[PDB]
Each structure stands twice: as structure tokens, then as C-alpha cells.
Write a protein that binds this ligand. Sequence first.
Ligand SMILES: *[C@@H]1O[C@H](CO)[C@@H](O[C@@H]2O[C@H](CO)[C@@H](O[C@@H]3O[C@H](CO)[C@@H](O)[C@H](O[C@H]4O[C@H](CO)[C@@H](O)[C@H](O)[C@@H]4O)[C@@H]3O)[C@H](O)[C@H]2NC(C)=O)[C@H](O)[C@H]1NC(C)=O
Ligand SMILES: *[C@@H]1O[C@H](CO)[C@@H](O[C@@H]2O[C@H](CO)[C@@H](O[C@@H]3O[C@H](CO)[C@@H](O)[C@H](O[C@H]4O[C@H](CO)[C@@H](O)[C@H](O)[C@@H]4O)[C@@H]3O)[C@H](O)[C@H]2NC(C)=O)[C@H](O)[C@H]1NC(C)=O
Ligand SMILES: *[C@@H]1O[C@H](CO)[C@@H](O[C@@H]2O[C@H](CO)[C@@H](O)[C@H](O)[C@H]2NC(C)=O)[C@H](O)[C@H]1NC(C)=O
Ligand SMILES: *[C@@H]1O[C@H](CO)[C@@H](O[C@@H]2O[C@H](CO)[C@@H](O)[C@H](O)[C@H]2NC(C)=O)[C@H](O)[C@H]1NC(C)=O
Ligand SMILES: *[C@@H]1O[C@H](CO)[C@@H](O[C@@H]2O[C@H](CO)[C@@H](O)[C@H](O)[C@H]2NC(C)=O)[C@H](O)[C@H]1NC(C)=O
Ligand SMILES: *[C@@H]1O[C@H](CO)[C@@H](O[C@@H]2O[C@H](CO)[C@@H](O)[C@H](O)[C@H]2NC(C)=O)[C@H](O)[C@H]1NC(C)=O
Ligand SMILES: *[C@@H]1O[C@H](CO)[C@@H](O[C@@H]2O[C@H](CO)[C@@H](O)[C@H](O)[C@H]2NC(C)=O)[C@H](O)[C@H]1NC(C)=O
Ligand SMILES: *[C@@H]1O[C@H](CO)[C@@H](O[C@@H]2O[C@H](CO)[C@@H](O)[C@H](O)[C@H]2NC(C)=O)[C@H](O)[C@H]1NC(C)=O
Ligand SMILES: *[C@@H]1O[C@H](CO)[C@@H](O)[C@H](O)[C@H]1NC(C)=O
Ligand SMILES: *[C@@H]1O[C@H](CO)[C@@H](O)[C@H](O)[C@H]1NC(C)=O
Ligand SMILES: *[C@@H]1O[C@H](CO)[C@@H](O)[C@H](O)[C@H]1NC(C)=O
Ligand SMILES: *[C@@H]1O[C@H](CO)[C@@H](O)[C@H](O)[C@H]1NC(C)=O
Ligand SMILES: *[C@@H]1O[C@H](CO)[C@@H](O)[C@H](O)[C@H]1NC(C)=O
Ligand SMILES: *[C@@H]1O[C@H](CO)[C@@H](O)[C@H](O)[C@H]1NC(C)=O
Ligand SMILES: [Ca+2]
Ligand SMILES: [Ca+2]
Ligand SMILES: [Cl-]
Ligand SMILES: [Cl-]
Ligand SMILES: [Zn+2]
Ligand SMILES: [Zn+2]
Ligand SMILES: [Zn+2]
Ligand SMILES: [Zn+2]
Lengths: 694, 694
Amino acid sequence: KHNMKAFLDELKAENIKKFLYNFTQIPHLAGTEQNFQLAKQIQSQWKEFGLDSVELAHYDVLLSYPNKTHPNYISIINEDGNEIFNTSLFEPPPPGYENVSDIVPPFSAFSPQGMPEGDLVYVNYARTEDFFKLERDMKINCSGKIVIARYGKVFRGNKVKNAQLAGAKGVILYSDPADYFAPGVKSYPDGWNLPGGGVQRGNILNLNGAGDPLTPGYPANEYAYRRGIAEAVGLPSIPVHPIGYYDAQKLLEKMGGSAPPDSSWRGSLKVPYNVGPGFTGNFSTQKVKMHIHSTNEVTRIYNVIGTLRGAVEPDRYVILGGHRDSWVFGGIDPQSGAAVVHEIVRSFGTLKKEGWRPRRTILFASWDAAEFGLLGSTEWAEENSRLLQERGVAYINADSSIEGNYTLRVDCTPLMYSLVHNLTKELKSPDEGFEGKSLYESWTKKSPSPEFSGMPRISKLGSGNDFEVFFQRLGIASGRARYTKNWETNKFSGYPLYHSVYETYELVEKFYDPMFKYHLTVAQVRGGMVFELANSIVLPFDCRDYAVVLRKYADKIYSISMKHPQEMKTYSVSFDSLFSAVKNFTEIASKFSERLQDFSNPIVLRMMNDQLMFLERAFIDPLGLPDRPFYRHVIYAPSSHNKYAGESFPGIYDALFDIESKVDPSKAWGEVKRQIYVAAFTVQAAAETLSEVA
Amino acid sequence: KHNMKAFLDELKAENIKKFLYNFTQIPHLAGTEQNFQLAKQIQSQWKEFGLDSVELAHYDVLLSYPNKTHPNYISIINEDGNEIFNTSLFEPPPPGYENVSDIVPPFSAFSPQGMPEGDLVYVNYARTEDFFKLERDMKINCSGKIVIARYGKVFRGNKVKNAQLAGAKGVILYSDPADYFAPGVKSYPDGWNLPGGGVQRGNILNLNGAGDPLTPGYPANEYAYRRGIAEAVGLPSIPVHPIGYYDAQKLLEKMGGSAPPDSSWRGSLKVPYNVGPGFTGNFSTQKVKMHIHSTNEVTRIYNVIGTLRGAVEPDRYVILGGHRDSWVFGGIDPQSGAAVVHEIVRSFGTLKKEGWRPRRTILFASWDAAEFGLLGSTEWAEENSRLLQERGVAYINADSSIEGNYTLRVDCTPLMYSLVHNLTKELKSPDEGFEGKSLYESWTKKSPSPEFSGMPRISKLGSGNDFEVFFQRLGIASGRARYTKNWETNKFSGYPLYHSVYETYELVEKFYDPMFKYHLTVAQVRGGMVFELANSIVLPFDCRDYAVVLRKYADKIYSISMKHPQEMKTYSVSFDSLFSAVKNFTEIASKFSERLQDFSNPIVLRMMNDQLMFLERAFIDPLGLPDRPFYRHVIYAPSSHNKYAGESFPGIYDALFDIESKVDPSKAWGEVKRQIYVAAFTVQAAAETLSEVA
Ligand SMILES: *[C@@H]1O[C@H](CO)[C@@H](O[C@@H]2O[C@H](CO)[C@@H](O[C@@H]3O[C@H](CO)[C@@H](O)[C@H](O[C@H]4O[C@H](CO)[C@@H](O)[C@H](O)[C@@H]4O)[C@@H]3O)[C@H](O)[C@H]2NC(C)=O)[C@H](O)[C@H]1NC(C)=O
Ligand SMILES: *[C@@H]1O[C@H](CO)[C@@H](O[C@@H]2O[C@H](CO)[C@@H](O[C@@H]3O[C@H](CO)[C@@H](O)[C@H](O[C@H]4O[C@H](CO)[C@@H](O)[C@H](O)[C@@H]4O)[C@@H]3O)[C@H](O)[C@H]2NC(C)=O)[C@H](O)[C@H]1NC(C)=O
Ligand SMILES: *[C@@H]1O[C@H](CO)[C@@H](O[C@@H]2O[C@H](CO)[C@@H](O)[C@H](O)[C@H]2NC(C)=O)[C@H](O)[C@H]1NC(C)=O
Ligand SMILES: *[C@@H]1O[C@H](CO)[C@@H](O[C@@H]2O[C@H](CO)[C@@H](O)[C@H](O)[C@H]2NC(C)=O)[C@H](O)[C@H]1NC(C)=O
Ligand SMILES: *[C@@H]1O[C@H](CO)[C@@H](O[C@@H]2O[C@H](CO)[C@@H](O)[C@H](O)[C@H]2NC(C)=O)[C@H](O)[C@H]1NC(C)=O
Ligand SMILES: *[C@@H]1O[C@H](CO)[C@@H](O[C@@H]2O[C@H](CO)[C@@H](O)[C@H](O)[C@H]2NC(C)=O)[C@H](O)[C@H]1NC(C)=O
Ligand SMILES: *[C@@H]1O[C@H](CO)[C@@H](O[C@@H]2O[C@H](CO)[C@@H](O)[C@H](O)[C@H]2NC(C)=O)[C@H](O)[C@H]1NC(C)=O
Ligand SMILES: *[C@@H]1O[C@H](CO)[C@@H](O[C@@H]2O[C@H](CO)[C@@H](O)[C@H](O)[C@H]2NC(C)=O)[C@H](O)[C@H]1NC(C)=O
Ligand SMILES: *[C@@H]1O[C@H](CO)[C@@H](O)[C@H](O)[C@H]1NC(C)=O
Ligand SMILES: *[C@@H]1O[C@H](CO)[C@@H](O)[C@H](O)[C@H]1NC(C)=O
Ligand SMILES: *[C@@H]1O[C@H](CO)[C@@H](O)[C@H](O)[C@H]1NC(C)=O
Ligand SMILES: *[C@@H]1O[C@H](CO)[C@@H](O)[C@H](O)[C@H]1NC(C)=O
Ligand SMILES: *[C@@H]1O[C@H](CO)[C@@H](O)[C@H](O)[C@H]1NC(C)=O
Ligand SMILES: *[C@@H]1O[C@H](CO)[C@@H](O)[C@H](O)[C@H]1NC(C)=O
Ligand SMILES: [Ca+2]
Ligand SMILES: [Ca+2]
Ligand SMILES: [Cl-]
Ligand SMILES: [Cl-]
Ligand SMILES: [Zn+2]
Ligand SMILES: [Zn+2]
Ligand SMILES: [Zn+2]
Ligand SMILES: [Zn+2]
């Protein structure tokens, strides 16, 4: 038979290993010739594997690169203006590379140019609450200071936005061993820890879903009209540069002014972690000076788009997508995902060559420029938004398949919870100690649900990856899965060698997944999801699972508001409409489920499949969230404080955030009430899409 | 058989006459008890006629009413402050009414309160070009003046916006006999002309599609959060009041200052039509003083919504809608349309009682508060936007069935051109001299297409009626048809007794349509359209007709730009992308049509029916047009200078309008190029929805 088992058994760990090696021998930086060549290779292989068509979709978007003849670096500068200490111009290459060319040196993509000098202030993780503590509790003023922040906890672009609004004139990001050196394991090449010369690259934009900074709303095609740089979306206004912890030690060791307010501000280096401003007495006249010369430039990028046409519903699309561009070799990010996608295409293509076709169309995508702000997926979605909105069933993401070797991680819409639970019950656990047990069993034991006994944890989708445009802009049911670590407090910090030159094929083969069994497990989960979505007669979504979580989020947002009972009294702030809506959604979703179970009629079926497909769509508000027009889902948006994290009822959440500090409480609470109304209405409207149609 | 002929033959002129009489005995002003009672009556009758369900959908929206104990009026005031002339407090009621209560006196709905006094300036029709002529050519300044304008040519809200931006402190609107008294016919009650005491009511908002001024984007339901009055959408900032031509004569007769610039500024009254400012020498110290005391108030309105469930595709909606509220008796506006809808429901219900059901669901609507800014249709569409966007096939409007007795008038999307031509070829002409000939034949002879021999004229949809939210906001194929006059230059001015107390059942039965044959003809056209849309196996849309008009509009907008060849050279303004897109649309639409003709497969059919249904949808831009977020169709929007008129390529049109006057030509031409890009992209994207799906 040609069934899911046939598809799944065809997948091989050894093939994933071979493709990973193949994709990680040279850098594949977005906008470079090396990455165009890999695009053309993937296009050629996907054709050979059997897909019906495979095309390149290209766009010309704003990218950012260091100046090769004018290196970025940071100095401590004495009173005479002599640079007495300079940060590194590059990371020491790992063994056997040392002669690889075109390794981009560490930089913060999209930093403007500048040479600011000033006194340092240390701002911990540069989170919203870190700046609150500095400004409000310690009365330290960052205006005209250079801030130095440790990576971790939140997306780096949020750090830079927060530094900017505090009045900083520059930001230095660094990797502290507290967050990037796991106790008892050795530095690369002899283990998976970050060495002191290692540095994490990454962009520092605040695009809020816009895609290419110059063309928000529309694809960056050949005739595109572009904003001027001063009106571009999301660009930082102050210079920014990342360094490793050997260099950070030299900048922090001399710091004076106030002590750290408490131990949550202290990293692992042998320094006081004083907040500053400036250095201790003997060095008080020394300053820090940044030298940033990177340039932004419009550059062509290439997505590879493969189609496997559906036999019965060719106008319904199930999309498996992940990016191809990397900062350097991309041994984990993204090639551990891209290799998994390659093997999934190969397995589907094997079935196709034997005469099989899935019920619905499957689209496979190799996105470009994800590292520069999800630009490739976003421009493509902007180009095809009408097709996706009326035909998009689901999007499964496929960035890195591993970030640890402990257990499964799934983040997805509630509509896919039942699909995930069911599929994982049918897959074998790859974990030591769980041989002959299901993946569901190992996952649930290692990552228990906080809410339910005998269930695994599944997180909300945030952002920082290519499902953002499909889920938060277009309202297409989306999910992602990978193997992960057991380091709760580091969830959003990245694995130690994240976006460093040390992220190589050897890292994976030696330390993370020698037998490629975790990669295989993830290929089974992602591929199994795609298979069921593209083949099940009734779409494998359960609207009742959304009803359950909506009630959880409504309790949560009500609890936040109830921290302010006097104001809720004064301004008559009622959550009654939102709970009413959630109750109705629960009642209607229950009845719809009964009909779906109780209904030979392909019209009723497809009518019902359309109701299932358009349910995620119904949570979209065409007016968007306040000042973030591309985050249109009313239930989920990326946290305004941390792009990686999802926030539920974001419009109400942001209206309540720090409300006790607002100067006009009447206005602020009026906006809370407005967002309650919008949320209650959207939940009720979504519920009504599940009612009988006439 | 139960076919279109059965449906059409069941329609009777005599029934339309009886319903019209029934709907026009008392006023049915929005928000009044009389109009709620008629809603409940229609709900009851539609149930009796056979519909599956009939419900009231109610909303609480901002309405506007005179103060009953503090009448609105205008004075000429002498130097002492004595009011030596007062305009009327009411229109002389027509014969047999004179004891009807609750006739709302003439007023401009949504006028703010005020008692401004000043000198008059006469501004012709208060069009954009009239103000250009005054300010630019005659150097007359309206700042702090009261402007007096004649009704006609453009929507009254555009007049008031234009007066406001000219700095007027008040606006007086009046009906000139030149525009509202046809030569050789008598005044009401002895003919269909406007008497000197008659006055045209109407709202003066500039909502640009927003619906209820207090809740843009969301339905005005029970828990709605409302803007404060100062942030409401579309409200005028200066007092406004309408008068008849006996009163206008008294205000204009004393006018001094400059002569009219030319004869296009002269109406038919026996006055000089001097522009002012102020009165001639002897009266120079007299002023004009307005007294406006109307109030805005949130008031419940009721839509009646009837459903006839589809037998095969119940989740596809074909909507026939028209409003029920009137300014006074509504003998033409809207009851001549509402009576036609009532008889259509009765005829469909007759077929249903004999066991028939249409293929798709038909929804019938009796909208409320249309006179106060299309509020009932818009709030309902805001509430149901997700259902309409994913299921809406078409909307056929049904306001007044007559505005003359000369020939047919149709305004619709290009997708319905072929449907209209075909249906009209099968219907009998009601016209004298065309007995035994088709409606197509009489219509084409009396209203020839400007472009094509042997074809009738069909206009673009503008606005000023309840299809606005469905077409320009949601992108649902829409159309309208009625019998019309032969008075080209008056097309947007209204028939003489428009929105006056004289618009009665007697007006229609005696002067417009004694035999109710034109009403019957219109019931056949509107009902026949609904029938074909709800019953044809393949939706009766022809995408090739859109290709033809797109090329016409692209030539037109290019010709406008080419008035500025030096600037197109300087700023490299190319229309090449737009023509390319139109060429591609033409090519793809031709191939799609071949497949639609060449394709027993209900999936392919419905796939193809979805491509047809979503084609109008594809012209929607979710970001809207500049500063008009609710006008989202990129091909058509209501003219920024006249809400009644449709404009094609509106975003490019407005970017080019008066561009020679802009202070920064680089910026202005940059915005023209931006709008070219948006248009080319949207046309290409729409074309791509007709490509093979995979
Ligand atoms: C969840 O679904 C339920 C339906 O099962 C839905 O119930 C609806 O609630 C609204 C608002 O509560 C009801 O609205 C009432 O409608 C009646 C006419 O049917 C009106 O007379 C009422 O207005 C009077 O009372 C108001 C409240 O005191 C006054 O403010 C007002 O001035 C009037 O005096 C009121 O409009 C509606 O009838 C029911 N519909 C039903 C039962 O079918 C509920 O709204 C859904 N939740 C959400 C968030 O949508
Ligand atoms: C109407 O449909 C046609 C398809 O039938 C579609 O044609 C496409 O036009 C674009 C833009 O003209 C072509 O884009 C080119 O793509 C090639 C690779 O395929 C690139 O190498 C080209 O870039 C070079 O040349 C440019 C122009 O001089 C330079 O600006 C650039 O820097 C590069 O040097 C260019 O991107 C595209 O290939 C075709 N696609 C086809 C033929 O299938 C057309 O765009 C449609 N119209 C609209 C308005 O969409
Ligand atoms: C990655 O694998 C690809 C595909 O096998 C290799 O590309 C092929 O290489 C051979 C030898 O040069 C050529 O003859 C083929 O035409 C190439 N096929 C393509 C591009 O489709 C490539 O060599 C491998 N790269 C590495 C670093 O191992
Ligand atoms: C840090 O780098 C700077 C820049 O290369 C060094 O300063 C330069 O040194 C050369 C040779 O002495 C001078 O001629 C340049 O004019 C200096 N450029 C400057 C100050 O911008 C500096 O010596 C380096 N510092 C250390 C500790 O190595
Ligand atoms: C996950 O599997 C469960 C158990 O098989 C599925 O639930 C069953 O579905 C069938 C078909 O509708 C029903 O007859 C059973 O009563 C259901 N059992 C339950 C709810 O306990 C469930 O549908 C699957 N989820 C998917 C496919 O998304
Ligand atoms: C318009 O027609 C309606 C429906 O025939 C009339 O309302 C009915 O009137 C009779 C007499 O009062 C009642 O017994 C019915 O219950 C009413 N039916 C309804 C409201 O559904 C109404 O009288 C007519 N109005 C005018 C002015 O002729
Ligand atoms: C126009 O109407 C105004 C208001 O009714 C009239 O002026 C009023 O006349 C009465 C009786 O003489 C006075 O007591 C009021 O105080 C006046 N009110 C004002 C000036 O606001 C005026 O007489 C009317 N003019 C004409 C020509 O009939
Ligand atoms: C209007 O009627 C014309 C003439 O009948 C229809 O065009 C014909 O459609 C049939 C079925 O596709 C074709 O076989 C003929 O070749 C067409 N004749 C032509 C184009 O001259 C047309 O489809 C009708 N329009 C509708 C129903 O919207
Ligand atoms: C790189 O270095 C210097 C900076 O002035 C100069 O040679 C060249 O313009 C730079 N390249 C850029 C800005 O892309
Ligand atoms: C922070 O410092 C700068 C000093 O130039 C000043 O302009 C700003 O107002 C200060 N803010 C506070 C709250 O002290
Ligand atoms: C893999 O798992 C083992 C066993 O828990 C652990 O000691 C090792 O550090 C893990 N490797 C990585 C990279 O997490
Ligand atoms: C109507 O007339 C007067 C205006 O002051 C007053 O009796 C009453 O408040 C008014 N009604 C309103 C404003 O609705
Ligand atoms: C129009 O008149 C007013 C007089 O108060 C003045 O403020 C305004 O600037 C004038 N504009 C022109 C163009 O004369
Ligand atoms: C109806 O038609 C006749 C004949 O052309 C015309 O004289 C009459 O004025 C028309 N009535 C109306 C109200 O247009
Ligand atoms: Ca873009
Ligand atoms: Ca509203
Ligand atoms: Cl992922
Ligand atoms: Cl109409
Ligand atoms: Zn990645
Ligand atoms: Zn990355
Ligand atoms: Zn009307
Ligand atoms: Zn009207």
C-alpha cells in the first residue's frame, strides 16, 4: 500500500546525514553566489526526486554586510585617544576550516554606521524589566551612554529597541558563559560549548512581520517601488556589534559606578558586573569606542518552490517550508532542517514514481534570507497572498531539526494538537531507556503538560521563524517540531554555538546526533504531519482544542487585569463579553464536531473541510494590531518584549502592560476596553464560521 | 418545470403596486417606532412567503435628528440684529397628508449645532473645480464666510467637505430650478417637478465606507466600545442646512461682490448669481445667520435578514439587498425598490412551496439606516465579514427601481456584463414603440455604449448605496439596475422630488409608472440576475470582460499622466508594468475560459467556481487606499470628489489629481510611481488566481 507507513519507512537517517554533510561544506550567506548555487542544486535534485514543478522565485531585498576593507571593531580608548584594547576582527576558525574563504566576520546585520565613544552602562539582558530596574529603581540614566548587554532570554532586536528608547548611543552584545557554557562540557572542538573567541551573529531589526524593509505589503519584484532608507521599516538608529566573552571580560572588568542590584544580574565571568556608568577611578578617563562600517544594500535572493500536485483537491495547499541561507556553515541552523526537508521530498517523490499522489497539493519551500528577517518567506507570501488565503490548509516549518538531544519540542496552533498527539503515539521513541516505547510516551514523560496529566507540553507559536507570515499575517494553521534540550531558563537563548562559525557538520555528527536518530524522528513528525494534512479525507483539525485554550487565555488575561481592581471599578472594565464569546465558541465547536462525525457527500465534506480550513483564518483582523499592521491574528502575536515568545490576547495584553505608569488612566483603560471588545467580537465571529452555513 | 421562466412569470405588476402602497402610507425614518414596526411586518411576511429563516439583526448606531422644540432655520439679520427674513420651518405637506404626523422637517443629518452669522459667498455646485475657480482664478476667499451652494452634480457630503477645507463657517444647500425643475412639466401635485417650498433632505457625512461613525471596523453590537464624538468618523465641523428655491431666491437676490465667472454658474432663478462676498451696497450691513440645533444620538436600527437555503451549495451566498428606511414616505426612495424585493421573495417562496430550492443559498435583506450613511448594511457586513468573504458569490442591490421612465440603467462589475446582456435579451421591453422587442434591444438603442456598436452602456459602480461595503470593502461581485431618465448632465443630481416630502405613492402611480410595467421589468432584471447567480451550475461570470475594461482603464490613467510629459521624463514614470499585468490578465483569462468550457467532475467545477467567486476578491488590498482604509478594491473606488461616481485605478488617479499644484514634485511623482506598482501587482496577482492551481 501507499499509506503513511510506506512514506515513513522510506525515510533514512543515513540520507539525512549525507545531505547535511553536503549542505555544510562552505558558507551559504544570503545574497552570495554560494547560496544561489545551492538553490540551483536543490532545484535540480527536487526535480530528480519526482516533484511536478520546481522553480526559483527571486526578489531584490535590503541585506546588510560588513565592509571587507574596513573591519568592524570596538576599542577601549585612553584620554589621548590611543586605542589600548581592540576586540577581535574574526572568530578563530575551527579545525580543518582555517583556510575556508568568505566566512563573514561577526556583525549585527542592519546596524547603521558610526564611531560613537562614551561611557559604558551594563544592562543585564537589556529586557524591558532590566531597563525599568535601571531607570526606575536605580535611577541610572542611559542617555548618551554605550550599553553593554548579554545575549539571552529575548530576541536581540528587542534589546536594541529597548536600548534605543532608553537613549543609548550604541549597543554591544556579548555571550556570557552563564548562558552559553553548560557546566562540565568542553568548548568546541572538543565539546559543544562556546569558546571565548566565539561570537553570535544575527540581525537586530524590529520588522514586526513586514518582510523586506523597503517594500512592506508588496513583493520586492522587478518593478517594485521602494521606500527610501529613512522610511524603511525596522532599522535601528544606533550602532550595534556582538563580541565573545574573552573580549567582554576586558570591557566589563574596569566597570565602576553602582553594584549589580542583585544576583540575577551577575553572569559567570570573574568581574563585579557593576552597572556603571563608566569605569572605576583609575580608569575613569578611558572611554569605549565603536567602529561600525557595515552597509545595507539591495541584493537578489532566491526561494526554491516545489509542487506535488494533489489528485483530488489540487487547489488546497499543504506547505512544508524552511530556510537555506546560513550565517556561516549552518550545521544546525538551518541545514539540520533543510536536510530533513530534502529527505522528505525524496520519500514523497518515491511514492509518486510508483503512481501515488497525495489528495491535496503539497508545496515544498527552501527559503532565502531568513537570517535577515524572514525576508524570502515573507516576500513570497506577499506575492501569493490571495492564493494562500483562499487555498492554504497548513504550513509546517522546517528550520533546525535539533537544538538539544533531550526530547521533542512542538509549538503549533491548537487545531493541530490532536494530530500531533495521534501521530506521536504511532512513532517509535529514539530516546535511551524508551526503546520499544512510543515518542508520545517519552515526550510526555520528559516534557509534561503544565495543565493536563498524561499529556505533553505544546507551546504557542511565537516568531523568529518562517511560519510568521503564514500564521500571524495570513491566518494559516501552522506548526513546528524539533528535538530540544532540558534547560528551561535558556529556552529563548539558543544553544551554545548558535550563529557562530563553530556550528558545523562535525558539531552535529560528534556531539548532537551521531546516529542521526533524532533527525530521523523529526523527519517522521514533520513528514507525518504533512502526510496527514495532505491526505486525510477530513482535515485533521479539532476545533474543540481551540475552545479549551481560549478559556485558558481568557482566564489569564482577566487575572492580569484583576491586579488593578480599583481601576476596573472606576472605568467599568468587564471581561463578560469575552467569556461569553469563549462559551459560545465551546458550544458551537462541540456541535460542529458532532456533525463532522455524523455527516458519501463530497459537498458537505468539503463544505466542512472549508469550515475547518477557514477557522484559523477567522482569527485574523484585517486592521491588524495597534501599530503592528502585519500581526493580524487576534489570539496570538509575537510578544512586544520578545519576538521569539508568543503572547495570547496580545492586543489586551499590551493595553494592560505597565498600565499603572500611564499618565492618563482614563484613556489607557478605555483602550483595554476597546481591545476586550475586539477580542470578544473576533472569538464570536470565528465561532460563527462553525455554525450551520444556512 | 421550476426554471427561470417559472420564477419570472410568477412576478406581477399588481403585487408590486399593492406593496408599494402598503410601504408608503406613513414615514419610516431610521430609528423610529414606525420603521421597527415595518421591519417586523416584513419579517412576518417573508416567513409566510416561505423563507427558511427570517431574523432581525439590530445595532446601536449614531443617528441625527432635529430638535422638535427648537427648529432649524436661516435668517437675514439687519445691523440691529432683527431677523427680517426667515426660511421655512417645514415643507407644505402634499394633498391628503397635511395631517400626517412625524414628518421630519428638512435638515442636513449630522450637522453640528451652531448659530454662525456672516456674509454669503455663492460657490455654484461647491465642486472641487468650483472652489479652484473661486480661490485660484477669482481670488475670492471663503474663510469665515457662509457658503451657499446649489445641490446637484456631486454628493452633498463632498460639497460640505470642500466648503470646510475652504474655511467656510457654515453651508446652505438649495435646490435650483435649473437642476430640479424640468421644462414644461408642472410642480407636484400636478406633475413631477419640485415646488418652490420643496426641500431635499440627506446626510452630509464623509464616512468613506466606515459605517457607524462610532465603531469603524466592528459591528455596533451590545458590548461595542465607541469612539467619543470628537474622534468619530466623517462628521462635519460646520453647520449645514438645506432650503428650497423660494427661500434661496430671497438669500441670493441681494448678493453683491463679483459677477458669476461664466454662464455655467448661473441657475434659472431671476437673480444675478453674483459670487459675493456679502450683499450689494444698500444691504451691505445685513448678514446671514444660521440656527441649527439638531442632535446626534445613538439609536437602535433593525435589518431584516431572510435565508433560502441552497440544495447543493448551501455555503455559497447570493444576496439581494435594499434599504427600508426613508426620509419621509419613500415613494421612490426606497420603497419602489423594497416593493420589488418583496415580490421577488414572494415568487421564490412560491417555487419553494412546490418543492424547489435554488442550487446556492439566497439571502434577502431589508437594510435600516441607509439614509444615514449605509449604516445597516455596513454594520451587518462588519459582523459577518468572515462568512461573506469566504462564501459571498454576489450582491445585487435593490434601492429605488425607478428614477425616470426612459430606459434601463445598470451599474455593475465587468464579471456580470455577459449575464446582464444575456438576461436582457430574454426579457420583453416595456417601452412604447418596442412592443414585442427585447429589453436588450430597447436599452441598447436608448443608451448606446460609448465603446461598442450594438451594445448598451453599463456604468462602473460608485457609491451612495448599500452595495458599497460588499464591493469596495469586501470584494464581492456586485450589481444594480433600475429604470432611469434621459438627462445626462443630471445623472448624479437626483430626480426632482428626491428626498422631499412630495415623494409619495401618488407620485409613482400618477407620473412615473401607472401600469407598474417599469417596476415589473426591474423585478425581472434583479430577480433574473439572482436566479442565475444562485442556480447556474457554472457561475455566470466572464473573466474576459474584466480584461477588456482593465485595458480601457490603463489607457485612461496613462493618458492623464501624459498631460505631464516633462515630469514623466524627470522622474522616470513608466506605466510599462501596468500594461504588462493587463496583458497577462488578458492571456490567462483567455486560457481559463477555454478550460471552463472544456473541463462530470464536481471538484474541478467547484474549484473553477471558487476561482470565479474569488476573482473579484483578488482586487482587494488589505492595506486599503491612502487614508481610506475601507475602500480596498484597487480597480474601483468612489471618487474622492463625488461619492456617487466610480473612479477607476483610484489610487493612481488621486496621486495624479492636481499634481501640477504640489509643492514637492519629487514626492508627488514618487507616490504616482508607488500607486502604479500597487496596481500592476494587484492586476498580476488577480490574473494568477485564474492560472492552473498546481
Ligand atoms: C453568545 O451567544 C448568545 C446567543 O445564544 C448571544 O446572546 C445574545 O446576546 C445579546 C446581548 O446580550 C442579546 O441582545 C439582546 O437582544 C434583545 C432582542 O433580542 C434586546 O431587546 C436586548 O436589548 C435590551 O437589553 C439590553 C441589555 O440590558 C439593553 O442594553 C438594550 O438597551 C435593550 O433594552 C439585547 O440587545 C441577544 O438577543 C442574544 N441572542 C440570542 C439569545 O439569540 C451572545 O451575545 C453571544 N456572545 C457574544 C459575545 O456574541
Ligand atoms: C507578465 O508575465 C510575464 C511572464 O510571461 C512576466 O515575465 C517575467 O518578467 C520578469 C521581469 O521582467 C522577468 O524577470 C527577469 O528574470 C530573470 C530570471 O528569470 C532575471 O535574470 C532578470 O533580472 C535581470 O534583468 C533585469 C531587467 O533588466 C535587471 O533589473 C536585473 O538586475 C537582472 O540583471 C529579471 O529578473 C521574469 O523572468 C519573467 N518571467 C517569465 C518570462 O516567466 C511578467 O513579469 C508579468 N508582468 C507582471 C507585471 O508581473
Ligand atoms: C552536494 O551534492 C551535489 C549533488 O550530488 C553535488 O553536485 C553534483 O556534483 C557532481 C560533481 O561535480 C556534478 O557532476 C553534478 O552535476 C552536481 N549535481 C548538481 C549540482 O545537481 C555536489 O558536488 C555536492 N557538494 C558537496 C560539497 O559535496
Ligand atoms: C587597535 O586598532 C587600531 C586601529 O588599527 C590601532 O591604532 C592604529 O595603530 C597604527 C599603528 O600604530 C596607527 O598608525 C593608526 O593610526 C592607529 N589608528 C587609530 C588609532 O585609529 C591600535 O594600535 C590597536 N590597538 C591595539 C592595542 O592593538
Ligand atoms: C486522534 O485519534 C482519535 C482516536 O482514534 C480520533 O478520535 C476518534 O475519531 C473517530 C472518527 O471520528 C470517532 O469515531 C471516535 O469516537 C474518536 N475517538 C475519540 C474522540 O476518543 C481523533 O479524531 C484523531 N484526531 C485526528 C485525526 O485529528
Ligand atoms: C400593510 O400590509 C400588512 C400585511 O397585510 C398589514 O398588516 C396586517 O394588518 C391586519 C389588520 O390590522 C392585521 O390583522 C395583521 O396582523 C397585519 N399583518 C402583519 C403586520 O403582518 C398592514 O395593515 C398594511 N398597512 C397599510 C398601511 O396598509
Ligand atoms: C424670524 O424668527 C425669529 C425667531 O422666532 C423672529 O424673532 C423673534 O420675534 C419675537 C416676537 O417679535 C421676539 O420676541 C423674539 O425675541 C425674536 N427672536 C429672535 C430675534 O431670535 C423674527 O421676528 C422672525 N422674522 C420674521 C421676518 O418673521
Ligand atoms: C451568454 O450566452 C452566450 C451565448 O449562448 C454564452 O456563450 C456560449 O456559451 C456556451 C457554453 O460555454 C459555449 O459553448 C458557446 O460557444 C458560447 N458562445 C459564445 C461565447 O458566443 C455565454 O456563456 C453566456 N454568458 C453567461 C452565461 O454568463
Ligand atoms: C569599504 O571601506 C571604505 C569606507 O570608506 C571604502 O573603501 C568603501 O567605500 C567601503 N565600501 C562600501 C561603503 O561599501
Ligand atoms: C537622562 O539624561 C539626559 C542627560 O543629557 C537628560 O537629557 C534626560 O532628561 C535624563 N532623564 C532623566 C529621567 O533623568
Ligand atoms: C546528549 O545527551 C547526553 C545524555 O543526557 C548528554 O550528556 C549530552 O550532553 C547531550 N548532547 C547534547 C549536545 O546536548
Ligand atoms: C431641544 O431644545 C432645547 C435646546 O436647548 C432643549 O429643550 C432640549 O435640551 C433640546 N433637546 C435636545 C438637545 O435633544
Ligand atoms: C483667506 O482669508 C483669511 C482672512 O481671515 C486668511 O486668514 C487666509 O490666509 C486667507 N487666504 C488667502 C489665500 O488669502
Ligand atoms: C414618462 O415618459 C413620457 C414620454 O417620454 C414623458 O413625457 C414623461 O415626462 C415621463 N415621466 C417621467 C416622470 O419621467
Ligand atoms: Ca515586501
Ligand atoms: Ca461599525
Ligand atoms: Cl522549526
Ligand atoms: Cl439600486
Ligand atoms: Zn534558522
Ligand atoms: Zn538563525
Ligand atoms: Zn435609497
Ligand atoms: Zn435616499
